[PDB]
Amino acid sequence: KTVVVTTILESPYVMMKKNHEMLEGNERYEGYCVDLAAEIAKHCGFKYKLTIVGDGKYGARDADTKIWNGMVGELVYGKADIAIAPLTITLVREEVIDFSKPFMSLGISIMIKKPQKSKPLTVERMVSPIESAEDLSKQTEIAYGTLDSGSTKEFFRRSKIAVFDKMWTYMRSAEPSVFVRTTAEGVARVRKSKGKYAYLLESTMNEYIEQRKPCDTMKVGGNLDSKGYGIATPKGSSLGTPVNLAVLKLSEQGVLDKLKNKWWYDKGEC
Amino acid sequence: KTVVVTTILESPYVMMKKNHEMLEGNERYEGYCVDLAAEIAKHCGFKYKLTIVGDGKYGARDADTKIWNGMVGELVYGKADIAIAPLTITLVREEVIDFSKPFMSLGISIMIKKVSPIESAEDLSKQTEIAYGTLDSGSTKEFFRRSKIAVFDKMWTYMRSAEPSVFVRTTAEGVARVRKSKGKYAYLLESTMNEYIEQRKPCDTMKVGGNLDSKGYGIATPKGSSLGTPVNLAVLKLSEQGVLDKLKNKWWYDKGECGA
Amino acid sequence: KTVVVTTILESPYVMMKKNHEMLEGNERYEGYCVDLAAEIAKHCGFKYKLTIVGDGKYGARDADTKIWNGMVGELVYGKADIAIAPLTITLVREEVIDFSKPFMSLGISIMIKKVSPIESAEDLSKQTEIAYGTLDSGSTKEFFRRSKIAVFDKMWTYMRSAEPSVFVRTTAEGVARVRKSKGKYAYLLESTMNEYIEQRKPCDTMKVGGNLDSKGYGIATPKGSSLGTPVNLAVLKLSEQGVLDKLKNKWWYDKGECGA
Amino acid sequence: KTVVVTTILESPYVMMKKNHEMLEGNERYEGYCVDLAAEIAKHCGFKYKLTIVGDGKYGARDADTKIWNGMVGELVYGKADIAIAPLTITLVREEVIDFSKPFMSLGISIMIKKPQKSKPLTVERMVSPIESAEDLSKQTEIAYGTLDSGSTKEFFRRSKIAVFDKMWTYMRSAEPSVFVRTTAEGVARVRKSKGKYAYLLESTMNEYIEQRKPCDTMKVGGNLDSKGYGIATPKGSSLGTPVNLAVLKLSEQGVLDKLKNKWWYDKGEC
Ligand SMILES: NS(=O)(=O)c1cc2c(cc1Cl)N[C@H]([C@H]1C[C@H]3C=C[C@@H]1C3)NS2(=O)=O
Ligand SMILES: NS(=O)(=O)c1cc2c(cc1Cl)N[C@H]([C@H]1C[C@H]3C=C[C@@H]1C3)NS2(=O)=O
Ligand SMILES: NS(=O)(=O)c1cc2c(cc1Cl)N[C@H]([C@H]1C[C@H]3C=C[C@@H]1C3)NS2(=O)=O
Ligand SMILES: NS(=O)(=O)c1cc2c(cc1Cl)N[C@H]([C@H]1C[C@H]3C=C[C@@H]1C3)NS2(=O)=O
Ligand SMILES: N[C@@H](CCC(=O)O)C(=O)O
Ligand SMILES: N[C@@H](CCC(=O)O)C(=O)O
Ligand SMILES: N[C@@H](CCC(=O)O)C(=O)O
Ligand SMILES: N[C@@H](CCC(=O)O)C(=O)O
């Protein structure tokens, strides 16, 4: 019996092939996550068919209803059996599903439009309004926001640190709304905001976008915390230990580093 | 009922209190792992007695005996209940004990006594003039042992067939040896350990290049134990809250006894 | 009894003189191959009639049909007696035809339009901005297909899985494309051919990096023939006497129609 | 029936290891040729026993006796059946044995003591007295000679080039004798001659000596000839074609380049 692997349409984890109007099956998508699924199936024998969640959300908890949605939400309800997707490992998700050991290090970073080149002897220097989260919280002339129903929204929602509390208090009463449904929408907002917008996203997508054309955006500051990407699995499933072992095996041989280099730096430019 | 805890004497993870002859119990130990164990006990609600394994090795498998030494051995043979210590998560140990979610990211890093013609691992393997070594019975010598890369295989062959034995019993002795070797030694060790060593006086050692790979530190637990899930939840909540980052800064960058 | 000699129209190995329409016989052909064949005919003592293959292919195996094309095909199938031409010695040809000792060393070279940003082959493979290709139905392509190195395999996938077809029927058209690509095309070809192209006007191409591997040009003879040993002896005598070096200098650097 | 492998004790092809007094069998010798023979026997299955010729000569034909000595000499008479050694391919040699395709590229180079660095603005440069062989022929104050009963001496004997004829004319009447018995003897004469002597040898050993400590010698000029090292085999033997195919395979997979790099450049003491 074949199992369904749920994934989110995000780059460079899963991208649409140029020739995909006629292709069918698992050959429709390319990226990091499809390679990870291929290696998982090579380490342990099973037939997998990738799918994309209709909602398109990573997964969070709704208010006053306590119903899980998104990738995690449909993984709890049994319509999916494994989520090989860039899903962060969180305490709220750890109490409802089983998470394998992280296969990708990440952190909340700062995304800003690349500032222009200051002419002043003829050397070329780079300056940026934002160099840390503290100064972004202090300043107000540049707006900032996160991705709706993601992991960073939950991180700022339940943070007792003073600076993160200030950022969250600014975010909840932001007029107009600052959150974005997709990473691409937030990136486009940074692109067309004339430097009047800061994006809070995971470091992996941030560096991939920085090293991709037209590369007019760059990351400043530092990682606000340390988290990881894990392979989801429903509670009481016979796949958690094999997938955990497979991730450990891939880490030991170094396949994960090879895929990261191939899909992050090998296709870079500028 | 009390809980038996096993750890190792490694800095800045577990150290000995300056005034420890006049103190008894758990008050004579301080460091990252001691505070971590205190918070884990607070979140779970159990009394724990911190102990140090009589053998000062982390744990491995000896030559053709199928016996676990170090902390993992005390964990599998009923001598221990939980090990909050710098125990790297690897495949081989995942089949004998339970690993919680990692609480400290790390990677294999090089360090030399202060042009730097040691830029990364490629030329270091290609340069046999200066020797190098790893910790015996740890997670690094085994990492080199079962690596399928050609460069890492060459490094393993050069490490095993070297006169004299470049392996060192304890990382402190290896640090001393590389400090007294006048640049004729590069020590392979974890990123956190190397950063802590290079961040203290006399600051005559530096980390160069980047990590050879990425790994983490896990709170080990005997297989099929009722404490694995509670400690995993405790690590998750401490990482979400940010206390782990606070302890990392407190025991790595707070004393600041050097200029960098 | 005359001897059929096969070859290809490749510069500077074979030239069609300058007024070939006014000449007939083997007197209308000049170049390294023509003079070399003259010397072999003088040493062995046989009359030969130089011919050009109908389809100017060096030799390859087609799509799972077990058919030899080009000069090697004309040799195995009885259409030719001996090949004096730039025929690289490789594994597959040795099993179907007899090779003499190499009379010209060679290697895989990188050619670009006029510090190079690529130089080494690994650097060229890592950068996908500049496309590259090989000569179809030759030895370079086959060398790339059977290469087991990761870099060379990724190269082979790069030229094979590219849009449009980077492969070119003749090395002359590839050289023209490189000169017309404004530095966006690197052509992979033999060191001798690349050096000859560079040495000629308008001197808008240069050779960067080293030679990827070790090959040579052999004089092809069909399997189990009586002319393999005499031709090998003639090649050895010419190499010892130094006529090969003089011919290479005369047809590669004697003209010197460039500033260097 | 095990096949006897005849070789010559020359570096870096065959060198004695530090722990060789107690070792026995093929493990006594380590170097380029020994692992080349190992790969040859791995490609085509046979059992090989390593041996070293008692005479220690590469091989040549004496005058008025028509008796072949050295490695080729003992190979012709039948006491050996294959030779994985740095043996050059020559017309006189191939007339009696069946060589294989050249597994190494070689030429005749010039060996000279490395001159001192010239003081004069503070840039440090180096100069050589005689770069090309022509200058060595015109010059007389620095002596030069080949290796006795080798390929270089044979080539100079039968050379028709004017400069090479002049060099041979000088060598044949050298007082005292200029030819050296072993490559090590020629190198030592170069070191102890204070720059008064020049050595003629194949480029491979010249490169090895240049890149080996204390690296007081260097090679000037280009490559006078262009020859190669082939695997010897008695005329009419059945091992010729398997050896040729194995050499071609090793060249094609890149093994030969790996051995050259790991026995010539990898131990870069200088
Ligand atoms: N270089 S990277 O961010 O793609 C990356 C990140 C990580 C990797 C492997 C790679 Cl390649 N493995 C580790 C895993 C290995 C074992 C120890 C920690 C987890 C379990 N997690 S990680 O530290 O999140
Ligand atoms: N900054 S650090 O090295 O002290 C550090 C490193 C890490 C932390 C927390 C901290 Cl504070 N948590 C993560 C864990 C949290 C959840 C997401 C990945 C694992 C499960 N592992 S980690 O990426 O190895
Ligand atoms: N200088 S060159 O490229 O024209 C050149 C190259 C070579 C020549 C002769 C010349 Cl002139 N002969 C050798 C052959 C001669 C004998 C020794 C090696 C083979 C058999 N092959 S080679 O090393 O490929
Ligand atoms: N890199 S090198 O000079 O040691 C070198 C040089 C050469 C090698 C192998 C090596 Cl390792 N093999 C080739 C051989 C392969 C086939 C084609 C030419 C001969 C037969 N000759 S070569 O071009 O003279
Ligand atoms: N990848 C994150 C959400 C994306 C983001 O943080 O921008 C998650 O798994 O929740
Ligand atoms: N964290 C390692 C330490 C040993 C090493 O650094 O090699 C272990 O537990 O084995
Ligand atoms: N002349 C080569 C082919 C040309 C090329 O590969 O560029 C041969 O003998 O096969
Ligand atoms: N190797 C040469 C002899 C000269 C030398 O080794 O320097 C030969 O095969 O004859």
Method: cryo-EM
Tokens 């998508």: give the residue.
A29
Which residue from A minimizes the CA distance to B217? A101
Residue A22 CB partners (closer than 8 Å, separation 6+): none
Which residue from D minimizes the CA distance to C246? D161
Residue A270 located in a structural domain: no
Q: Which two tokens stand for residue B177?
A: 């040896």
Q: Which two tokens stand for residue C59?
A: 């030799």
Rounded to the nearest angstrom, the minimum Cα separation between B120 and chain D is: 16
From chain B, pick out residues whose CB is under 8 angstroms from the CB of A99. 101
* D141 and B CB contact within 8 Å: no
The answer to whether residues C138 and C12 belong to one domain is no
- Say if CB B60 and CB B138 are below 8 A apart: yes
From chain C, pick out residues whose CB is under 8 angstroms from the CB of A266. 126, 128
Q: What angle do CA D74, D244, D240 make, to 5 degrees?
A: 45
**Is D94 within 8 Å of C232 when comparing Cβ atoms?**
yes
Check contact A-D (3+ Cβ pairs < 8 Å).
no
Binding site feature residues of D for L-glutamate:
86, 88, 93, 151-152, 202
- Say if CB B68 and CB B76 are below 8 A apart: yes
D122 CA to centre of ligand 6 in angstroms: 50
In whole angstroms, give the CA distance from residue B224 to residue B243: 28
The answer to whether residues A53 and A119 belong to one domain is no
Cis peptide before A214 (omega within 30 of 0): yes
In whole angstroms, give the CA distance from residue A53 to residue A64: 23
Rounded to the nearest angstrom, the minimum Cα separation between C126 and chain A is: 7
The per-residue DSSP string of D213-242 comes to: TT--EEEES--S--EEE--B-BTT-TTHHH
Any ligand 3 atom below 6 A from CB of C239: yes
In whole angstroms, give the CA distance from residue D207 to residue D193: 20
- Say if CB D84 and CB D44 are below 8 A apart: no
**Is B126 within 8 Å of D266 when comparing Cβ atoms?**
yes
3-state secondary structure of A181: coil
Q: What angle do CA A203, A207, A208 make, to 5 degrees?
A: 115
Tokens 């072993």: give the residue.
D182
Q: What angle do CA B231, B225, A233 make, to 5 degrees?
A: 70
Beta strand D68-69 with C215-222: parallel, antiparallel or unpaired? unpaired
User: Please, which chains are in contact with D (at least 3 CB pairs closer than 8 A)?
Assistant: B, C
Nearest-CA residue for ligand 6 atom 4 is B138
From chain D, pick out residues whose CB is under 8 angstroms from the CB of B122. none
Residue C212 CB partners (closer than 8 Å, separation 6+): C107, C108, C109, C121
C214 CA to centre of ligand 4 in angstroms: 4
In whole angstroms, give the CA distance from residue C85 to residue C237: 18
Instruction: Report which secondary-structure segment, H or E, holds A104.
Output: strand A104-106
Which residue from C minimizes the CA distance to A265? C126
In whole angstroms, give the CA distance from residue D126 to residue C3: 56
In whole angstroms, give the CA distance from residue B142 to residue A58: 37
- Torsion angle in degrees (nearest 10) through CA of A154, A155, A160, A163: -120
In whole angstroms, give the CA distance from residue B72 to residue B74: 5
Does the annotation flag A90 for ligand binding?
Answer: no
A202 CA to centre of ligand 5 in angstroms: 6
- Torsion angle in degrees (nearest 10) through CA of B201, B204, B210, B216: -30
The answer to whether residues A66 and A143 belong to one domain is no
Residue B14 CB partners (closer than 8 Å, separation 6+): B7, B8, B29, B30, B31, B32, B33, B34, B50, B52, B85
Ligand 5: residues with CB < 6 A are: A 58, 86-88, 147, 150-152, 183, 201-202
Where does chain B show beta strands of DSSP type E?
Answer: 3-7, 15-16, 29-30, 48-52, 83-88, 97-99, 105-106, 108-113, 131-133, 185-190, 205-208, 215-222
In whole angstroms, give the CA distance from residue A199 to residue A143: 9
Residue D114 located in a structural domain: yes
Instruction: Report which secondary-structure segment, H or E, holds B171.
Output: helix B171-179
Domain count, chain A: 2
Any ligand 6 atom below 6 A from CB of B174: no
Strand partners, B133: B187
Of B88, B34, B81, B33, the closest CA to residue B58 belongs to B88
C258 CA to centre of ligand 3 in angstroms: 26
Does the annotation flag B128 for ligand binding?
Answer: no
Breaks (C-N over 2.5 A) in chain D follow: 120
The answer to whether residues B95 and B144 belong to one domain is no
Residue D270 located in a structural domain: no
Any ligand 1 atom below 6 A from CB of B107: no
Of B88, B110, B85, B104, the closest CA to residue B194 belongs to B110
Does the annotation flag B222 for ligand binding?
Answer: no
D247 CA to centre of ligand 6 in angstroms: 45
The answer to whether residues A200 and A232 belong to one domain is no
In whole angstroms, give the CA distance from residue A180 to residue C136: 51
Residue B178 located in a structural domain: yes
Instruction: Report which secondary-structure segment, H or E, holds C148.
Output: none
- The dihedral sign for the CA sequence D48, D53, D57, D63: negative
Residue A34 located in a structural domain: yes
From chain D, pick out residues whose CB is under 8 angstroms from the CB of B128. 266-267
CATH of residue C127? 3.40.190.10
Cβ contacts below 8 Å, chain A against chain C, sum to 4
Residue B260 located in a structural domain: no
Contacts by A209-212, CB closer than 8 A, 24 or more apart: A209/A111, A211/A264, A211/A265, A211/A268, A211/A269, A211/A270, A212/A267, A212/A268, A212/A269
From chain C, pick out residues whose CB is under 8 angstroms from the CB of A269. 129
Q: Which two tokens stand for residue B174?
A: 């290896």
Q: At residue B81, what is the residue type?
A: D
Q: What are phi and psi of C33, to 5 degrees?
A: -65, -40
Nearest-CA residue for ligand 5 atom 7 is A201
Out of D94, D253, D256, closest to residue C236 by CB: D94
**Ligand 6 mutation target, pool B139, B147, B191, B196, most atoms within 8 A of CB:** B139
Q: At residue A73, what is the residue type?
A: G
Of B147, B114, B113, the closest CA to residue B132 belongs to B113
> Which runs of consecutive H residues, i.e. helices, occur in A64-217?
70-76, 91-94, 133-138, 152-157, 162-172, 183-192, 203-210
User: Please, which chains are in contact with C (at least 3 CB pairs closer than 8 A)?
Assistant: A, D
- Say if CB A12 and CB A261 are below 8 A apart: no
Q: Which two tokens stand for residue D210?
A: 């240049």
Conformational region of residue C240, where left means phi above 0, alpha means psi within -120 to 50, and beta covers everything else:
alpha
Q: Which two tokens stand for residue B147?
A: 């690596």
> Which runs of consecutive H residues, i.e. helices, occur in D6-161?
32-43, 70-76, 91-94, 133-138, 151-157
* B163 and D CB contact within 8 Å: no
Q: Which two tokens stand for residue B101?
A: 């979610």
Strand partners, C49: C4
From chain B, pick out residues whose CB is under 8 angstroms from the CB of D211. none
Strand partners, B3: B48
Conformational region of residue C23, where left means phi above 0, alpha means psi within -120 to 50, and beta covers everything else:
beta
The answer to whether residues A28 and A82 belong to one domain is yes
- Say if CB A249 and CB A193 are below 8 A apart: no
Of C148, C162, C152, the closest CA to residue C188 belongs to C152
3-state secondary structure of B48: strand
**Is D160 within 8 Å of C101 when comparing Cβ atoms?**
no
C229 CA to centre of ligand 3 in angstroms: 17
Residue C253 CB partners (closer than 8 Å, separation 6+): C199
The answer to whether residues C10 and C85 belong to one domain is yes
Any ligand 1 atom below 6 A from CB of A251: yes
The answer to whether residues C53 and C75 belong to one domain is yes
- Say if CB C83 and CB C220 are below 8 A apart: yes
Q: Which two tokens stand for residue B122?
A: 């490629």
CB count within 10 Å of CB B143 equals: 20
Does the annotation flag A12 for ligand binding?
Answer: no
**Is B232 within 8 Å of A94 when comparing Cβ atoms?**
yes
C90 CA to centre of ligand 8 in angstroms: 27
In whole angstroms, give the CA distance from residue A250 to residue A41: 12
The answer to whether residues A144 and A74 belong to one domain is no
Q: Print burial letters for A83-94: b (CB count within 10 Å at least 16), e (below 16).
A: bbbbbbbbbbbb
Beta strand C131-133 with C185-190: parallel, antiparallel or unpaired? parallel
The answer to whether residues C121 and C81 belong to one domain is no
CA B231 to chain centre: 19
The answer to whether residues C189 and C242 belong to one domain is no
Nearest-CA residue for ligand 4 atom 3 is D105
The answer to whether residues C87 and C152 belong to one domain is no
Rounded to the nearest angstrom, the minimum Cα separation between C173 and chain D is: 27
- Torsion angle in degrees (nearest 10) through CA of D15, D17, D23, D28: -20
Residue A269 located in a structural domain: no
3-state secondary structure of D140: coil
Q: State which residues form the domain around D160.
A: 108-220
D126 CA to centre of ligand 8 in angstroms: 30
Rounded to the nearest angstrom, the minimum Cα separation between C251 and chain A is: 43
Integer CA distances (angstroms), D119 to D123, D125, D127, D194, in order? 8, 8, 11, 19
Which residue from A minimizes the CA distance to B149? A253
Tokens 């290090």: give the residue.
A105
Q: Which of residues 86-115 of A touch B (CB under 8 A)?
A: 89-91, 94-95, 99, 101-102, 105
Tokens 């392509």: give the residue.
C141
